[PDB]
mmCIF file of C-alpha atoms in Angstrom:
data_model
loop_
_atom_site.group_PDB
_atom_site.id
_atom_site.type_symbol
_atom_site.label_atom_id
_atom_site.label_comp_id
_atom_site.label_asym_id
_atom_site.label_seq_id
_atom_site.Cartn_x
_atom_site.Cartn_y
_atom_site.Cartn_z
ATOM 1 C CA UNK A 1 43.196 -23.485 15.902
ATOM 2 C CA UNK A 2 40.825 -22.725 13.012
ATOM 3 C CA UNK A 3 41.837 -19.836 10.730
ATOM 4 C CA UNK A 4 40.538 -20.977 7.352
ATOM 5 C CA UNK A 5 40.535 -18.518 4.461
ATOM 6 C CA UNK A 6 37.363 -16.454 4.215
ATOM 7 C CA UNK A 7 35.968 -17.195 7.676
ATOM 8 C CA UNK A 8 33.188 -14.812 8.643
ATOM 9 C CA UNK A 9 32.849 -13.490 5.092
ATOM 10 C CA UNK A 10 29.316 -14.842 4.683
ATOM 11 C CA UNK A 11 28.331 -12.781 7.725
ATOM 12 C CA UNK A 12 30.423 -9.883 6.392
ATOM 13 C CA UNK A 13 28.395 -9.829 3.174
ATOM 14 C CA UNK A 14 24.998 -10.554 4.746
ATOM 15 C CA UNK A 15 24.835 -8.340 7.869
ATOM 16 C CA UNK A 16 25.429 -4.594 8.103
ATOM 17 C CA UNK A 17 26.648 -4.837 11.709
ATOM 18 C CA UNK A 18 29.277 -7.468 10.906
ATOM 19 C CA UNK A 19 30.282 -5.245 7.996
ATOM 20 C CA UNK A 20 30.668 -2.362 10.450
ATOM 21 C CA UNK A 21 32.819 -4.435 12.815
ATOM 22 C CA UNK A 22 35.098 -5.682 10.039
ATOM 23 C CA UNK A 23 35.275 -2.233 8.419
ATOM 24 C CA UNK A 24 36.275 -0.508 11.657
ATOM 25 C CA UNK A 25 38.919 -3.152 12.313
ATOM 26 C CA UNK A 26 40.266 -3.030 8.753
ATOM 27 C CA UNK A 27 40.414 0.769 8.744
ATOM 28 C CA UNK A 28 42.277 0.798 12.052
ATOM 29 C CA UNK A 29 44.708 -1.847 10.807
ATOM 30 C CA UNK A 30 45.345 0.021 7.551
ATOM 31 C CA UNK A 31 45.857 3.335 9.337
ATOM 32 C CA UNK A 32 47.956 2.166 12.308
ATOM 33 C CA UNK A 33 49.738 -0.971 11.024
ATOM 34 C CA UNK A 34 49.684 -0.726 7.224
ATOM 35 C CA UNK A 35 47.735 -3.872 6.291
ATOM 36 C CA UNK A 36 44.145 -4.917 5.670
ATOM 37 C CA UNK A 37 42.956 -7.751 7.895
ATOM 38 C CA UNK A 38 40.098 -8.242 5.437
ATOM 39 C CA UNK A 39 42.644 -8.796 2.670
ATOM 40 C CA UNK A 40 44.572 -11.218 4.887
ATOM 41 C CA UNK A 41 41.457 -13.229 5.743
ATOM 42 C CA UNK A 42 39.959 -13.245 2.241
ATOM 43 C CA UNK A 43 43.134 -13.980 0.258
ATOM 44 C CA UNK A 44 45.577 -15.471 2.799
ATOM 45 C CA UNK A 45 48.739 -14.273 1.010
ATOM 46 C CA UNK A 46 51.980 -16.079 1.783
ATOM 47 C CA UNK A 47 53.948 -12.830 2.137
ATOM 48 C CA UNK A 48 52.895 -9.235 2.786
ATOM 49 C CA UNK A 49 55.025 -6.101 2.455
ATOM 50 C CA UNK A 50 54.363 -3.057 4.647
ATOM 51 C CA UNK A 51 55.605 0.294 3.333
ATOM 52 C CA UNK A 52 56.561 3.074 5.743
ATOM 53 C CA UNK A 53 56.666 6.015 3.329
ATOM 54 C CA UNK A 54 54.805 9.238 3.995
ATOM 55 C CA UNK A 55 53.612 10.755 7.251
ATOM 56 C CA UNK A 56 51.042 8.015 7.853
ATOM 57 C CA UNK A 57 53.646 5.407 6.947
ATOM 58 C CA UNK A 58 56.111 6.905 9.416
ATOM 59 C CA UNK A 59 53.431 6.871 12.106
ATOM 60 C CA UNK A 60 52.914 3.185 11.284
ATOM 61 C CA UNK A 61 56.671 2.617 11.484
ATOM 62 C CA UNK A 62 56.779 4.267 14.906
ATOM 63 C CA UNK A 63 53.883 2.049 15.994
ATOM 64 C CA UNK B 1 59.893 13.764 -21.941
ATOM 65 C CA UNK B 2 60.444 16.757 -24.214
ATOM 66 C CA UNK B 3 60.374 17.181 -27.982
ATOM 67 C CA UNK B 4 62.746 19.770 -29.528
ATOM 68 C CA UNK B 5 60.800 22.832 -30.686
ATOM 69 C CA UNK B 6 62.737 25.915 -31.785
ATOM 70 C CA UNK B 7 62.154 29.051 -33.804
ATOM 71 C CA UNK B 8 58.505 29.122 -32.692
ATOM 72 C CA UNK B 9 57.590 32.513 -31.267
ATOM 73 C CA UNK B 10 54.203 33.803 -30.221
ATOM 74 C CA UNK B 11 53.249 34.281 -33.882
ATOM 75 C CA UNK B 12 54.201 30.666 -34.734
ATOM 76 C CA UNK B 13 52.734 28.564 -31.934
ATOM 77 C CA UNK B 14 52.219 25.704 -34.364
ATOM 78 C CA UNK B 15 51.062 22.095 -34.235
ATOM 79 C CA UNK B 16 54.542 21.118 -33.071
ATOM 80 C CA UNK B 17 54.328 23.580 -30.171
ATOM 81 C CA UNK B 18 50.840 22.399 -29.197
ATOM 82 C CA UNK B 19 51.876 18.735 -29.325
ATOM 83 C CA UNK B 20 55.005 19.537 -27.327
ATOM 84 C CA UNK B 21 52.937 21.310 -24.693
ATOM 85 C CA UNK B 22 50.695 18.256 -24.484
ATOM 86 C CA UNK B 23 53.715 15.995 -23.894
ATOM 87 C CA UNK B 24 55.469 18.244 -21.394
ATOM 88 C CA UNK B 25 52.465 19.470 -19.364
ATOM 89 C CA UNK B 26 49.078 17.934 -20.105
ATOM 90 C CA UNK B 27 49.922 14.273 -20.512
ATOM 91 C CA UNK B 28 52.589 14.691 -17.829
ATOM 92 C CA UNK B 29 49.930 15.699 -15.307
ATOM 93 C CA UNK B 30 47.712 12.916 -16.649
ATOM 94 C CA UNK B 31 50.527 10.413 -16.048
ATOM 95 C CA UNK B 32 50.933 11.643 -12.471
ATOM 96 C CA UNK B 33 47.176 11.513 -11.916
ATOM 97 C CA UNK B 34 46.965 8.018 -13.386
ATOM 98 C CA UNK B 35 49.697 6.827 -11.036
ATOM 99 C CA UNK B 36 47.733 8.379 -8.171
ATOM 100 C CA UNK B 37 44.492 6.724 -9.282
ATOM 101 C CA UNK B 38 46.244 3.348 -9.413
ATOM 102 C CA UNK B 39 48.043 3.754 -6.065
ATOM 103 C CA UNK B 40 46.114 1.661 -3.476
ATOM 104 C CA UNK B 41 48.010 2.697 -0.338
ATOM 105 C CA UNK B 42 48.756 6.038 1.311
ATOM 106 C CA UNK B 43 52.072 4.825 2.797
ATOM 107 C CA UNK B 44 54.182 4.486 -0.394
ATOM 108 C CA UNK B 45 54.207 7.812 -2.255
ATOM 109 C CA UNK B 46 55.887 8.364 -5.607
ATOM 110 C CA UNK B 47 58.479 11.129 -5.833
ATOM 111 C CA UNK B 48 57.781 13.051 -9.049
ATOM 112 C CA UNK B 49 61.065 14.614 -10.210
ATOM 113 C CA UNK B 50 59.776 17.519 -12.286
ATOM 114 C CA UNK B 51 62.295 18.978 -14.798
ATOM 115 C CA UNK B 52 61.673 22.622 -14.022
ATOM 116 C CA UNK B 53 63.503 25.314 -15.965
ATOM 117 C CA UNK B 54 64.917 28.591 -14.585
ATOM 118 C CA UNK B 55 64.314 30.407 -17.897
ATOM 119 C CA UNK B 56 60.587 31.096 -18.317
ATOM 120 C CA UNK B 57 60.685 32.868 -21.658
ATOM 121 C CA UNK B 58 64.082 34.476 -21.061
ATOM 122 C CA UNK B 59 65.429 33.264 -24.417
ATOM 123 C CA UNK B 60 62.174 33.247 -26.381
ATOM 124 C CA UNK B 61 61.422 31.501 -29.666
ATOM 125 C CA UNK B 62 61.002 28.207 -27.778
ATOM 126 C CA UNK B 63 57.334 27.589 -28.551
ATOM 127 C CA UNK B 64 55.413 26.640 -25.411
ATOM 128 C CA UNK B 65 58.398 25.228 -23.492
ATOM 129 C CA UNK B 66 58.373 28.013 -20.897
ATOM 130 C CA UNK B 67 54.600 27.690 -20.557
ATOM 131 C CA UNK B 68 54.886 23.961 -19.853
ATOM 132 C CA UNK B 69 57.753 24.360 -17.398
ATOM 133 C CA UNK B 70 56.099 27.147 -15.409
ATOM 134 C CA UNK B 71 52.807 25.230 -15.423
ATOM 135 C CA UNK B 72 54.628 22.344 -13.747
ATOM 136 C CA UNK B 73 55.258 24.657 -10.776
ATOM 137 C CA UNK B 74 51.576 24.594 -9.772
ATOM 138 C CA UNK B 75 52.024 21.054 -8.426
ATOM 139 C CA UNK B 76 53.883 22.536 -5.452
ATOM 140 C CA UNK B 77 50.742 24.360 -4.332
ATOM 141 C CA UNK B 78 48.354 21.634 -5.500
ATOM 142 C CA UNK B 79 50.186 19.139 -3.284
ATOM 143 C CA UNK B 80 48.558 20.866 -0.299
ATOM 144 C CA UNK B 81 45.241 21.776 -1.917
ATOM 145 C CA UNK B 82 44.306 18.371 -3.400
ATOM 146 C CA UNK B 83 43.913 14.828 -2.090
ATOM 147 C CA UNK B 84 47.134 13.440 -3.627
ATOM 148 C CA UNK B 85 49.697 14.760 -1.148
ATOM 149 C CA UNK B 86 50.175 11.308 0.388
ATOM 150 C CA UNK B 87 50.258 9.566 -3.020
ATOM 151 C CA UNK B 88 52.649 11.834 -4.943
ATOM 152 C CA UNK B 89 55.437 14.053 -3.619
ATOM 153 C CA UNK B 90 56.716 16.899 -5.766
ATOM 154 C CA UNK B 91 60.470 17.384 -6.254
ATOM 155 C CA UNK B 92 61.011 20.139 -8.796
ATOM 156 C CA UNK B 93 64.571 20.137 -10.127
ATOM 157 C CA UNK B 94 65.308 23.495 -11.760
ATOM 158 C CA UNK B 95 67.884 22.151 -14.210
ATOM 159 C CA UNK B 96 70.624 24.573 -15.220
ATOM 160 C CA UNK B 97 73.058 24.866 -18.104
ATOM 161 C CA UNK B 98 73.634 21.267 -19.207
ATOM 162 C CA UNK B 99 76.373 20.651 -21.766
ATOM 163 C CA UNK B 100 75.975 18.243 -24.663
ATOM 164 C CA UNK B 101 72.175 18.403 -24.541
ATOM 165 C CA UNK B 102 70.271 19.582 -27.589
ATOM 166 C CA UNK B 103 68.634 22.453 -25.712
ATOM 167 C CA UNK B 104 72.067 24.070 -25.223
ATOM 168 C CA UNK B 105 74.334 22.179 -27.658
ATOM 169 C CA UNK B 106 74.576 25.384 -29.703
ATOM 170 C CA UNK B 107 75.837 27.216 -26.581
ATOM 171 C CA UNK B 108 78.631 24.832 -25.535
ATOM 172 C CA UNK B 109 81.137 27.242 -27.083
ATOM 173 C CA UNK B 110 79.866 30.056 -24.813
ATOM 174 C CA UNK B 111 79.692 27.785 -21.751
ATOM 175 C CA UNK B 112 83.255 28.800 -20.836
ATOM 176 C CA UNK B 113 82.431 32.492 -21.156
ATOM 177 C CA UNK B 114 79.383 31.958 -18.960
ATOM 178 C CA UNK B 115 81.524 30.160 -16.368
ATOM 179 C CA UNK B 116 84.146 32.934 -16.409
ATOM 180 C CA UNK B 117 81.983 35.065 -14.051
ATOM 181 C CA UNK B 118 82.052 32.464 -11.279
ATOM 182 C CA UNK B 119 79.033 30.523 -12.560
ATOM 183 C CA UNK B 120 78.758 26.760 -12.993
ATOM 184 C CA UNK B 121 77.804 24.907 -16.151
ATOM 185 C CA UNK B 122 77.082 21.192 -15.860
ATOM 186 C CA UNK B 123 77.933 18.140 -17.913
ATOM 187 C CA UNK B 124 75.389 15.356 -18.328
ATOM 188 C CA UNK B 125 77.044 13.193 -15.668
ATOM 189 C CA UNK B 126 77.089 16.107 -13.210
ATOM 190 C CA UNK B 127 73.404 16.860 -13.818
ATOM 191 C CA UNK B 128 72.570 13.181 -13.347
ATOM 192 C CA UNK B 129 74.543 13.132 -10.097
ATOM 193 C CA UNK B 130 72.706 16.214 -8.845
ATOM 194 C CA UNK B 131 69.235 14.919 -9.744
ATOM 195 C CA UNK B 132 70.041 11.520 -8.226
ATOM 196 C CA UNK B 133 70.943 13.465 -5.101
ATOM 197 C CA UNK B 134 67.235 14.293 -4.934
ATOM 198 C CA UNK B 135 66.469 10.573 -4.461
ATOM 199 C CA UNK B 136 68.436 10.156 -1.232
ATOM 200 C CA UNK B 137 66.419 8.949 1.788
ATOM 201 C CA UNK B 138 66.685 12.368 3.443
ATOM 202 C CA UNK B 139 65.400 14.293 0.426
ATOM 203 C CA UNK B 140 62.770 11.579 -0.045
ATOM 204 C CA UNK B 141 61.511 12.190 3.494
ATOM 205 C CA UNK B 142 61.667 15.938 2.878
ATOM 206 C CA UNK B 143 59.554 15.585 -0.270
ATOM 207 C CA UNK B 144 57.074 13.455 1.664
ATOM 208 C CA UNK B 145 56.847 16.190 4.307
#
C-alpha cells in the first residue's frame, strides 16, 4: 500500500544493522536475480533490464 | 587498430614502431581494462575479438607487430588469473591471408600460388563473415565459459 521512493533509507544510512540487512538482501538479489533492490527503492526506475550473460547470468536465468 | 609499419627490423625499432606497439598492445589492454572498470554488472560481459596473427616474426621487418600480436595472447591465461573473467571474454581470431588489405596487398599476386597447395586465402568479405561467426550466441556462450 505504501512503497514510496527511498523508504527506509534514513535508517539505512544511520544504523549499521539496517545497513547489514539491506546489504545482505541487495547482494542476494544481485547474485540470484540480477537487480539491486536498493537501486529500485532509491531511484524507482520505470524500466529495468536484466542481463543473463556469463555463468552468474546464466544461473540467474535458470532461477 | 593497427598502423602500417614496414621495413623496421630489430636494428630500426623506431618511434613509429614504438607508437604502433602502444596502439596495438598497450592502449589496447588499457581500453579493455577501462571497459572492465566501467562495467557495473557481472552478468553482461564484453567479448573482446582480438586480431591475433599466426606469423610471430615469420616474415620479419615488421617492427613490433609480432610482439604486439603475441602479447595479446596472454589475455587467454589472464582471463583465469585475474578478476575480469566475468567482465571480459577473450575471443582471439588468428586472422589468415586476407586479400586487398595493406598488410598483404603486395602478396595478392602470389595468393594463387599459395592456394595451389590446397590452402585457403581469404577476401575481406570472407574474413568478415568468419569473424562475425565468432559473435554467434553459441560462440558467445563458449567465450563466456
